[PDB]
Amino acid sequence: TDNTFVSGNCDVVIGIVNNTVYDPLQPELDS
Amino acid sequence: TDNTFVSGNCDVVIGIVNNTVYDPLQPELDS
């Protein structure tokens, strides 16, 4: 999430793909 | 905080206004 940024949804961009964003806040909450 | 950065104070800036900053750690820590 620090290298990328969010804008809109995935129903507009042509050629868009799916992946998993490694949010660094997630393992900090679980620690 | 991902779109702004802190510096100085609200006394030196001419024409500054008041607002509220969405802290991404606030809802994540509460959740």
From Swiss-Prot, chains A, B:
Glycosylation sites: N18
Role this protein plays: Subunit of the fusion protein that is processed upon entry into the host cell. Mediates fusion of the virion and cellular membranes by functioning as a class I viral fusion protein. Contains a viral fusion peptide that is unmasked after S2 cleavage. This cleavage can occur at the cell membrane by host TMPRSS2 or during endocytosis by host CSTL. In either case, this triggers an extensive and irreversible conformational change that leads to fusion of the viral envelope with the cellular cytoplasmic membrane, releasing viral genomic RNA into the host cell cytoplasm.
Protein name: Spike protein S2'
Taxonomic source organism: Severe acute respiratory syndrome coronavirus 2
Organism lineage: Viruses, Riboviria, Orthornavirae, Pisuviricota, Pisoniviricetes
Gene that this polypeptide is encoded by: S
Full-protein interval shown: 1117 to 1147 of 1273
